Structures are given as structure tokens and as C-alpha cells.
Write a structure and sequence with these properties.
129 residues, mainly alpha, Histone Acetyltransferase, Chain A, binds 4-bromanyl-1,8-naphthyridine, Bromodomain-containing protein 4
Length: 129
Amino acid sequence: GSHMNPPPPETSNPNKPKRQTNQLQYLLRVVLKTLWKHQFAWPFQQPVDAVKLNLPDYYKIIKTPMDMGTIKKRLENNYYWNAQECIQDFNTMFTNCYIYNKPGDDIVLMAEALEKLFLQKINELPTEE
Ligand SMILES: Brc1ccnc2ncccc12
Ligand SMILES: Brc1ccnc2ncccc12
């Protein structure tokens, strides 16, 4: 892509520790599956392309970018060590949107809908076994 967009977040790194857990399996099979097909998911399914969107300040304001495409790849490629790392990525994604954008903007309403669903699903994150 454009040299003015940063590299996406890491999704493969032999140096980083990782494992499967039943919680991470739930995060893929239930949480990301349910969010991905939400009617408002599409803006969040890939990194923000600040060039195409004419947001030249985006990556000056958002220094820890995250999106559900990256999360999906991290889950499918078994990048994570624990559920907390993945939950953190979701929460970064939502809060980036709320930091960059005005309350009540469409993109914020979209994020808020996804976040509502996310919290309902994480309340049922299974006991680690
Ligand atoms: Br598309 C998109 C996704 C996430 N955040 C965004 N913020 C502003 C404009 C477009 C955005
Ligand atoms: Br793509 C895009 C660009 C700017 N604003 C947006 N708001 C909502 C959803 C997608 C957006």
C-alpha cells in the first residue's frame, strides 16, 4: 500500500510466545465471528487507510492502531498467549475510534454497537480449562 500508511500491526513473529487456550478459541469462534458479521463491522475489518480517507493526521493521533482484520489474523495464526492480549486489541480498536472521532459521529455509533455486542460476549468468556 501507500508509503504514508504505517505497516500494519504484527500478525506473525517466531520470537513471540503463543499458545492455544479454550478462551482464545472462544474469542475466534464466538466473539470475532459474531462481530465480523455485524452490519456495522465493515469499517473495522482492515486497518484505517488514512491516505484513501484523507485523514493525514490519523497516525499522528492514533499511535497504537488496531482493527478486526488484524485481530482475525492474530487469532487464526495463533499469535496470542492469552485472552487478555486479544481483549486488549479489541479495546484498543474501540478506544482509538472514540479518541479520533466526535461523540455521535457515525463511525462512533458503529463502534459503540460493536462494543456493546463484544461486552455481552466477553461476559460469557469460558473459565480457562
Ligand atoms: Br473507516 C474508519 C475506521 C475507524 N476509524 C475511523 N475514523 C475516522 C474515519 C474513518 C474510520
Ligand atoms: Br469509510 C468512512 C470514512 C469516513 N467516515 C466514515 N464513517 C462511518 C463509516 C465509514 C466511514
